[PDB]
Design a protein around this nucleic acid. Structure first.
Ligand SMILES: Cc1cn([C@H]2CC[C@@H](COP(=O)(O)OP(=O)(O)OP(=O)(O)O)O2)c(=O)[nH]c1=O
Ligand SMILES: [Mg+2]
Ligand SMILES: [Zn+2]
Length: 1025
DNA sequence: AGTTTTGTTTTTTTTTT
DNA sequence: AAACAAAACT
RNA sequence: AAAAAAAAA
DNA sequence: TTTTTTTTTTTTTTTTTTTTTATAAA
DNA sequence: AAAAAAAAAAAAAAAAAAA
DNA sequence: AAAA
């Protein structure tokens, strides 16, 4: 079965022929003998045909010379068989060499192109580095399976039969009891879309809407069974979009899809931590055609606009703008309530749906859509999509016969996640409505359910009655929906006053009782909240230690190892902070940094100080992650939710009410409270507040009355003023006191405000007028806001909040450090200005795109290398002499510049610089640091000079302690290696005009100095000429 | 008149289901 | 994390 | 070796 | 209930002690 | 020579006692 | 070498 090889899309001739035939197919064929649904499948056939004809012809053309030479040679050598002739034996000898020459040159180019690709990526957070830490990928196979007979057997046809028959059976059984489905849907109260929303769903698809979905498709994904890639649609979107628009208009009008839209390829994924050999345990992941996914993406985006009307905020999975940590913190707060409660009769139950996406009954799903009020062209298209889907299973690369998908949503489809949620929402609403399933009461809050996708947790009081009624309702839902739970795999915490009472409830109920802990959404919930640190954070330290211990001999530098910590460790650390932001002891951070540094410096003491690595300005953009500042950024982030005061955030309201419940709405940018006994038992919120204050006083802010103080605040309420006035001001004029206006602008800022001014309750203006015009009020409110205050007040999106706060914290806590560039200036007798020190830092960033070349420069400037002077101090000795043996004292400036063994190389480089007909002083700061005197600071030739100098640095460093001269030829080899890596990358990225500028002059000079012997031995030949 | 800063956009990997 | 472009401050 | 949302660099 | 004193914790600064054996390539 | 760690000082918040 |  064919696939498009994306490499063909690059090639100038291939593109021109395809663009020509796409025009020619549609102009010829398009008429009313054909439906557009048929015509689209006919187009794809012709297009797949032409790619095959183009690929084959291209491959012939590339081989034509060796084709000819091999034919011509064998002809002459058969002439040898009758009579053996000297001149022919010469001619045969000549050509047989040239055949071997061409085969060599093709081989080398393939190696150099591969090395060039790796040279761009090395030590970067990219697929190569990610693959280095991971084990070898698998090619999925079956050779042994466990049989319907109960046998473990290995016959190839018997496995193909046993797999297919099993998956065919899973999807086969569609329910038929439509009248019972209606009865369940009438039993309960459900939302409805209104006429404006429904009109939005059914609106005509447009050409601009299609191109936006094409632009966003994920590159480097497998194609569907027809073998066209996302890269194809992106390449030809100019031709394809007019015809695609005609396709979707025809589907809207008729509700008939093309036959290919139904097709999908199942590949079998083994589930984590379970048997391969059981057919029981695989996940079927589907590949669909890209044209069908374009349509399905259109429909999913439309319904996503409305989804918050349909789905209650107890569901956070798949929902835009929601967070999984919302459910984790809510659940921990409920568990604390039970721990505190004097009379215990309570249960917490974790439930998961078995094969949830596969077992949804499609007729129930379509009835649900109508009941919510979705009908018209949108419902018509959804019904067509489910009319007859089929799968083929691809096993060991072989394509099995196809079966119908009569249950389930399509498990690799963009529309399937939302459709599953809408169906599950019918059960969620029914549980909330039913009052003999009793929730837990937390002051003014009742809590019953939290959902994440198909994952469900339930909070009950008086479980003996309440849990039985829950099970009964789920049975009724199962009969109509198809949804099913495994009750034994469902885990519960049970709380009772006596052991007798526990034994009764356990006897009656089907659930598994967890004494210590339940794993949930990535974390451990504990039966007592005291345990949170022990179960979550202590295990996380132990797991990081083992992980770095395995990696300890991995072959990358300290630069690459820093990136490994960022890529692999940092995400799981942040996730745990965000789920459970409890006060952590200082020893936790001490152990985490010791472990991480010991890995980066390969169990040897650091070569560069962690102080210098702290800031991006220093060390060329390599930065070490600060775990304490990430912890502070996560704890402080909660304050953004307190200021927003959103009705969806029930997780924030859930902490112990005991003295006073409202206070968190009043804390931020609002007046200090005398009472200091709120939050006595707070797990999260009290620690958040203490961190917020400490940062504000570090900044020397007054946090308590600000340009962002709300009208809905204690400041206005301690003025004893009627809520009708408060609401009037917000309705008319906006929410901040600065929107009212203070001092001389009290209402006068707009006519709309003075239009408001008369309206308000008579005496309350005199109260307001006094406060708003007071001398202290004008001073505090009129000041300019800081960047810190803008984070919490200004932004309507929680998006990207940890990264903003962390960037502020790094400036607030910015430390002083030693500068290596100053020590260089002392090793030489010279002063570097601020402009010189700026040039050194920029150069260390901009010397290359490759981290390989950048690392070498960074090590040179930052004084990485050991010296005899340093080593004699360490060993407590007086033998500080140059290791090369020239007899002088081994300072760092001796080792790089001044040693007589190194000096002949540097003079060689200055001879080339005269052949480029530059002129530069002979000054160690230019090649080692990148600091030029004030004339040459501008010059265009610096990119050439940078390549010459960094090549010299490599040559000297390679024989650092050796009693021999660095040679000129080793220097030319390095400079030619860099030239080669840059050439293939410059083509791949279409940069060849830049490349020719830098290298062209230098390349001519390198070739002029070598002999033909040397050029042959070291394979030095032009890639430009 | 010149350089630095701030924001958006395109590309990588990891977390949950 | 990088690059590019727009606006303000030195 | 596919889908959705979220997070960081 | 309010104000002042005392005690504890955290963060920053300064001084003292210890190191590593060459490096880049892989 | 250079980096890290330990020790001491300084400041602010919280608690208890007195006015 | 650490991809497709
Ligand atoms: C992990 C994962 C999940 N999904 C979707 C589709 C199903 C739901 C539920 O997945 P679940 O872990 O419950 O598994 P489930 O299918 O419900 O089977 P069991 O719950 O193990 O019976 O999430 C997916 O599309 N891709 C994935 O890689
Ligand atoms: Mg499930
Ligand atoms: Zn020397």
């Amino acid at each position: 079965t064919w696939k498009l090889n994306n490499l063909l899309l690059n090639d100038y001739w291939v593109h021109n022929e395809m663009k020509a035939e796409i025009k020619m197919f549609f102009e010829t064929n398009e008429n009313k003998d054909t439906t557009y649904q048929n015509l689209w499948d006919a187009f794809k056939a012709v297009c797949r045909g032409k790619f095959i004809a183009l690929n084959a012809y291209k491959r012939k053309q590339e081989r034509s010379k060796i084709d000819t030479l091999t034919s011509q040679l064998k002809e002459l050598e058969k002439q040898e068989q009758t009579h053996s002739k000297a001149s022919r034996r010469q001619e045969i000898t000549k050509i047989r060499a040239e055949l071997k020459e061409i085969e060599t040159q093709k081989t080398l180019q393939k190696i150099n192109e591969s090395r060039s690709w790796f040279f761009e990526r090395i030590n970067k957070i990219d697929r190569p580095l990610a693959r280095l830490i991971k084990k070898k990928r698998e090619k999925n196979q079956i050779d042994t399976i466990k049989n319907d007979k109960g046998d473990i057997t290995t016959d190839p046809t018997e496995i193909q039969t046993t797999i297919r028959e099993y998956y065919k059976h899973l999807y086969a059984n569609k329910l038929e009891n439509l009248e019972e489905m209606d009865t369940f849907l009438d039993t309960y109260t459900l939302p409805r879309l209104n006429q404006e929303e429904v009109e939005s769903l059914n609106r005509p698809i447009t050409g601009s809407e299609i191109v936006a979905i094409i632009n966003s498709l994920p590159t480097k994904k497998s194609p569907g069974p027809d073998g066209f890639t996302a890269e194809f649609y992106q390449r030809y979107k100019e031709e394809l979009v007019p015809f695609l628009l005609k396709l979707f208009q025809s589907i809207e009008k008729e509700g008939i899809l093309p036959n290919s839209f139904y097709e999908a390829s199942i590949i079998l994924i083994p589930k984590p931590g379970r048997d391969t050999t059981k057919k029981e345990n695989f996940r079927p992941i589907s590949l669909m055609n890209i044209d069908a996914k374009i349509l399905n993406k259109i429909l999913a985006n439309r319904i996503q606009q409305h989804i918050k009307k349909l789905i209650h905020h107890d569901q956070v999975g798949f929902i835009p703008g929601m967070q999984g940590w919302f459910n984790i913190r809510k659940s921990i707060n409920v568990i604390q309530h039970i721990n505190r409660a004097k009379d215990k009769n309570h249960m917490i139950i974790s439930i998961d749906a078995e094969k949830a996406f596969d077992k949804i009954q499609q007729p129930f799903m379509l009835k649900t859509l109508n009941k919510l009020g979705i009908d018209g062209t949108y419902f018509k298209i959804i019904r067509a999509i489910y009319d007859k889907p089929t799968a083929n299973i691809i096993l060991n690369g072989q394509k099995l016969e196809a079966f119908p998908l009569k249950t389930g949503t399509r498990q690799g489809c963009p529309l399937s996640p939302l459709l599953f949620n809408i169906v599950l929402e019918v059960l969620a609403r029914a549980i909330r409505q039913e009052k003999e399933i009793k929730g837990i009461q937390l002051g003014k809050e009742e809590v019953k359910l939290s959902l994440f996708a198909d994952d469900m947790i339930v909070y009950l009081e008086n479980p003996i009655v309440s849990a039985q009624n829950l099970l009964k309702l789920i049975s009724n839902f199962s009969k109509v929906s198809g949804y099913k739970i495994n009750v034994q795999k469902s885990q519960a915490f049970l709380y009772t006053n006596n052991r007798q009472t526990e034994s009764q409830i356990m006897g009656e109920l089907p659930f598994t009782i967890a004494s210590k802990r339940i794993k949930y959404l990535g974390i451990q919930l504990t039966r007592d909240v005291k345990d949170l640190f022990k179960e979550n954070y202590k295990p996380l330290l132990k797991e990081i230690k083992e992980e770095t211990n395995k990696w300890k001999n991995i072959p990358c530098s300290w630069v690459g190892r820093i990136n490994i910590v960022k890529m692999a460790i940092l995400p799981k650390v942040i996730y745990r902070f965000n789920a459970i932001p409890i006060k952590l002891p200082m020893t936790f951070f001490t152990e985490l940094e010791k472990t991480t540094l010991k890995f980066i410096w390969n169990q040897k003491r650091a070569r560069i100080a962690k102080s210098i690595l702290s800031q991006k300005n220093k060390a060329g953009g390599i930065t070490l992650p600060d775990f304490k500042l990430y912890y502070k950024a996560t704890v402080t982030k909660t304050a953004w939710y307190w200021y927003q005061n959103r009705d969806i955030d029930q997780w924030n309201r859930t902490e112990p009410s005991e003295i006073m419940p409202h206070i968190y709405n009043y804390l931020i940018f609002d007046k200090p409270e005398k009472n200091k006994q709120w939050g006595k038992d707070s797990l999260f919120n009290k620690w958040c507040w203490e961190n917020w204050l400490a940062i504000c006083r570090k900044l020397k802010l007054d946090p308590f009355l600000t340009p962002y103080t709300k009208i809905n605040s204690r400041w206005i309420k301690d003025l004893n003023v009627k809520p009708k006035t408060i609401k009037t001001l917000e309705e008319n004029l906006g929410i901040t006191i600065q929107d009212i206006g203070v001092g001389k602008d009290f209402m006068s800022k707009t006519p709309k405000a003075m239009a408001t001014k008369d309206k308000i309750d008579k005496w309350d203006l005199i109260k307001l007028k006094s406060f708003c015009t007071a001398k202290e009020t004008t001073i505090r409110v009129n000041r300019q806001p800081t960047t810190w205050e803008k984070i919490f007040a200004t932004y309507s999106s929680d998006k990207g909040l940890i990264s903003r706060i962390y960037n502020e914290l790094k400036q607030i806590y910015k430390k002083k450090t030693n500068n290596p560039i100053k020590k260089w200036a002392k090793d030489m007798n010279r002063h570097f200005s601020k402009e010189d020190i700026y040039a050194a830092k920029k150069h260390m960033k901009k010397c290359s795109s490759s981290l390989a070349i950048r690392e070498m420069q960074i090590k040179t400037t930052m004084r990485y290398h050991l010296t005899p002077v340093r080593m004699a101090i360490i060993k407590k000795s007086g033998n500080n002499r140059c290791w090369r043996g020239c007899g002088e004292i081994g300072t760092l400036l001796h080792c790089w510049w001044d040693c007589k063994l190194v000096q002949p190389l540097w003079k060689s480089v200055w001879r080339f610089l005269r052949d480029l007909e530059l002129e530069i002083p002979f000054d160690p700061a230019i090649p080692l640091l990148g600091i030029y005197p004030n004339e040459y600071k501008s010059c265009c030739y610096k990119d050439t000079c940078t390549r010459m100098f960094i090549a010299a640095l490599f040559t000297i460093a390679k024989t650092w302690n050796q009693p021999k001269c660095p040679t000129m030829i080793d220097w030319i080899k390095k400079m030619w290696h860099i030239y080669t890596m840059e050439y293939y990358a410059a083509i791949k990225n279409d940069e060849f005009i830049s490349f020719v500028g830098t290298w062209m002059k230098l390349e001519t000079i390198i070739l002029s100095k070598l002999s033909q012997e040397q050029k042959t031995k070291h394979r030095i030949f032009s890639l430009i000429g």
